[PDB]
Amino acid sequence: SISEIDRSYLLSSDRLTEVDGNTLDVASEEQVAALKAQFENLKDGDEVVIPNGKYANLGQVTITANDVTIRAEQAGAAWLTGLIQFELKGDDITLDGLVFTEGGPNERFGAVRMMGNGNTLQNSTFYYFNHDYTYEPDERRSEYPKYLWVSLWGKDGKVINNRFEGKQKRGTLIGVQKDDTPDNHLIANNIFMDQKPNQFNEFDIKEAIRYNGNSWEAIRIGDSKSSQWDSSSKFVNNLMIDMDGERELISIKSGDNTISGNTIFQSAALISLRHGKGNTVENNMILGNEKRLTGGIRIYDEDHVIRNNYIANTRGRDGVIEGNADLRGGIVINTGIIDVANGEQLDQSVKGKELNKQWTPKNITIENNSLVDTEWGIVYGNQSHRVSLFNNAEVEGIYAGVDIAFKHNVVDNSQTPEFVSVRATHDFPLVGATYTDETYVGQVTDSELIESYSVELPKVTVENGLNAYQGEGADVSKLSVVTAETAGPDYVLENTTK
Ligand SMILES: O=C(O)[C@@H]1O[C@@H](O[C@H]2[C@H](O)[C@H](O)[C@H](O[C@H]3[C@H](O)[C@H](O)[C@H](O[C@H]4[C@H](O)[C@H](O)[C@H](O)O[C@H]4C(=O)O)O[C@H]3C(=O)O)O[C@H]2C(=O)O)[C@@H](O)[C@@H](O)[C@@H]1O
Numbered sequence: 001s002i003s004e005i006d007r008s009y010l011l012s013s014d015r016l017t018e019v020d021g022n023t024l025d026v027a028s029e030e031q032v033a034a035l036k037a038q039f040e041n042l043k044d045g046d047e048v049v050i051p052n053g054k055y056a057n058l059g060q061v062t063i064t065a066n067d068v069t070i071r072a073e074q075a076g077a078a079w080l081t082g083l084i085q086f087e088l089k090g091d092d093i094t095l096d097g098l099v100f101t102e103g104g105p106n107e108r109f110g111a112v113r114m115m116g117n118g119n120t121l122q123n124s125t126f127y128y129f130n131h132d133y134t135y136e137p138d139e140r141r142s143e144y145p146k147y148l149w150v151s152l153w154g155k156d157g158k159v160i161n162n163r164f165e166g167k168q169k170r171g172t173l174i175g176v177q178k179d180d181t182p183d184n185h186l187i188a189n190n191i192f193m194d195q196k197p198n199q200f201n202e203f204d205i206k207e208a209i210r211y212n213g214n215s216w217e218a219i220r221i222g223d224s225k226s227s228q229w230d231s232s233s234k235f236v237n238n239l240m241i242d243m244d245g246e247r248e249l250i251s252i253k254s255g256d257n258t259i260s261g262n263t264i265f266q267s268a269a270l271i272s273l274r275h276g277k278g279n280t281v282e283n284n285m286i287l288g289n290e291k292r293l294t295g296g297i298r299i300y301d302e303d304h305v306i307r308n309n310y311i312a313n314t315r316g317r318d319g320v321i322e323g324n325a326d327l328r329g330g331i332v333i334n335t336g337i338i339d340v341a342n343g344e345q346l347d348q349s350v351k352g353k354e355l356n357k358q359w360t361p362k363n364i365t366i367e368n369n370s371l372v373d374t375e376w377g378i379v380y381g382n383q384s385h386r387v388s389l390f391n392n393a394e395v396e397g398i399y400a401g402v403d404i405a406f407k408h409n410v411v412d413n414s415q416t417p418e419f420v421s422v423r424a425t426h427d428f429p430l431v432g433a434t435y436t437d438e439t440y441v442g443q444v445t446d447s448e449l450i451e452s453y454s455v456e457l458p459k460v461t462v463e464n465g466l467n468a469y470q471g472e473g474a475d476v477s478k479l480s481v482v483t484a485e486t487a488g489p490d491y492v493l494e495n496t497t498k
Pocket residue numbers: 146148172175177210214215222223224225248251274323324325326355356357388389
């Protein structure tokens with residue numbers, strides 16, 4: 001039952017083999033060199049099968065061949081340590097069953113740079129791959145370097161059935177580096193665990209905290225320069241546990257993406273529609289389990305669809321680092337810095353309103369969500385933005401969300417009705433908000449901004465440990481918890497080192 005879920009349950013499956021790292025032999029400098037030549041002399045259609053063992057410091061491994069598979073002889077038993085980057089330049093390259101641990105990326109765009117079309121990373125495990133690369137506050141501004149683990153630069157990439165555990169230095173774990181056309185990447189059925197910041201005193205440098213405490217996402221799809229183009233990528237059916245990197249768990253920074261059906265458990269980080277248009281966030285199960293600074297989804301930009309999510313037991317309103325508009329709750333409609341009600345846009349040529357700034361939300365559909373025991377439920381934004389991560393001046397000119405349509409949502413704080421189910425604010429009234437058959441039980445601040453809603457719960461049943469509200473809220477038929485029965489590789493590792 002929902003409240004009783006824990007990591008052990010989420011991570012258990014009888015399908016999983018144990019791979020003992022202690023039973024693996026360390027390849028010699030000679031054997032590593034030989035493995036390396038094999039990689040680089042591949043012909044199209046070939047396979048490289050890596051004998052069980054631990055292989056230190058492969059370094060820069062460039063794959064130019066098409067239609068090749070690089071795989072462990074036994075899944076999980078080819079451990080790649082020290083510095084390594086697979087740079088996948090050919091099309092239709094598959095990496096399969098690899099382990100990256102006790103080492104770090106040889107170049108900052110990750111252990112795996114998926115640059116061709118149809119590249120795949122599957123059944124693989126990253127375990128605390130935070131080591132061996134220089135990691136210092138820089139001379140210019142005391143900024144620590146961002147190192148990713150996987151990056152996607154081509155088309156039709158798939159990152160499926162992997163485990164990405166313990167990313168604990170700065171940098172997004174997966175980055176999509178796209179161009180002007182749709183990418184159609186699939187990031188699905190992965191396990192993400194234990195990302196967290198400030199494990200190496202990065203935050204001790206107080207003047208640099210706004211940026212040093214930023215760029216710890218689990219995934220970033222697109223970026224500010226590319227954000228006004230469609231990616232059409234999918235982040236679906238993933239299991240995320242104790243992912244606490246930063247304010248954004250997932251940063252969507254491009255258009256037409258799907259972020260749906262993921263289970264997000266005790267993660268102090270929000271799905272963030274940061275830049276770009278027309279993104280859809282549906283059927284996710286966000287189970288905060290009462291952990292501080294958990295939350296659902298925060299929203300900038302236009303045309304998004306947020307429907308049928310189940311967001312439960314979340315806590316906390318204000319992130320610890322200031323000036324980053326870090327306002328949390330179940331669903332947060334951010335302020336931005338442009339007058340969208342009069343058609344204003346962000347624009348790379350307009351000083352102060354560049355594409356990396358804050359697009360006031362507009363034309364948002366928020367329907368059939370169930371928010372259960374959320375300390376801050378639907379939060380209408382009031383943040384004051386800074387000019388940039390590096391300029392701490394406050395922007396004068398802050399606007400509220402526009403044309404926000406709420407329908408059939410249920411915010412059920414019947415357990416602790418002192419919790420704020422809907423946080424409206426006369427400081428920033430929404431413009432053209434509509435309310436259709438909303439149900440809000442618990443505190444509603446500035447309720448006179450809201451035309452109508454019901455304060456009486458429909459009939460409530462429990463189906464599969466979820467609340468089902470008769471005729472309203474998230475349809476529980478569309479919802480299920482992702483566990484290691486479908487997510488992650490088909491093995492677990494023993495005798496690893498952080
Ligand atoms: O969430 C907020 O309310 C808000 O978020 C912060 O803004 C966004 C902006 O896009 C900002 O520029 C910044 O993104 C940078 C950053 O450097 C990030 O790591 C990423 O870098 C990518 C990108 O492809 C780059 O071109 C690059 O060379 O490296 C990549 C990398 O992964 O290293 O994207 C760039 C960028 O595209 O501009 O942070 C963003 C974010 O965190 O969501 C900021 O306004 C913050 O104060 C505020 O909290």
